[PDB]
């Protein structure tokens, strides 16, 4: 279905599509989400138009998978995912990214945590991730510009693709493994609270079409 309501969600078959316009207050405009199909993955698209709040994210329209029982990062064997998307619009200042929160407390709220892991498959405009660049890193056979910094008490790591990656296939476990082995990330004690994919827009007008998205925890 379709909806532009601030907190609309469409759930089914282990997937949830959310408008999640948490930053609508920061500007003028709208955001709508359309869930086409949630069978064997999520096919959907987000449409929006925003002005004002130059560097304030207006929302994170996204698709995510249900996680019945939280497990530690190290205990998980693989977190495979595939994504086929495209962005159209004008003066697009936004990204396309996976978003995952982890915390030592397995019952932690799922929209935040000790850490936030982002994987930006796309980056439009002069927008910037939380923190500062830590340089280039290789994960899953692809190069990424890694960003790190605090957003309050929470630590945020953002792996930003160096070219828009519209057809992606990877294992999120590779990213956690990188942090565990290079940043002292406590993979043994951190639980994966969420596994999401969507777009954080700032200004402009755009439509993120997600022809296909799959994600799972094994
Ligand atoms: C993604 O595509 C837009 C539009 O061509 C471009 O401006 C931007 O630099 C690209 N981003 C990356 C990470 O290549």
TrEMBL record:
Covalent S-S links between cysteines: 4-32
What UniProt keywords are attached to this protein's entry? Carbohydrate metabolism, Glycosidase, Hydrolase, Polysaccharide degradation, Pyrrolidone carboxylic acid, Signal
- The entry annotates sugar attachment on 164
Q: Which Pfam family, just one, is annotated for this protein?
A: Glyco_hydro_12
InterPro entries attached here? ConA-like_dom_sf (IPR013320), GH11/12 (IPR013319), GH12 (IPR002594)
EC? 3.2.1.4
Pyrrolidone carboxylic acid occurs at 1
Reading the lineage from the top rank, the first entry is Eukaryota
Q: Which GO terms describe its biological process?
A: polysaccharide catabolic process
Molecular function per GO: cellulase activity
User: Top-level EC class, please?
Assistant: hydrolase
Family named by the database record: Belongs to the glycosyl hydrolase 12 (cellulase H) family.
What is the protein name given in its UniProt record?
Beta-1,4-glucanase
Q: Which organism is it from?
A: Hypocrea jecorina (Trichoderma reesei)
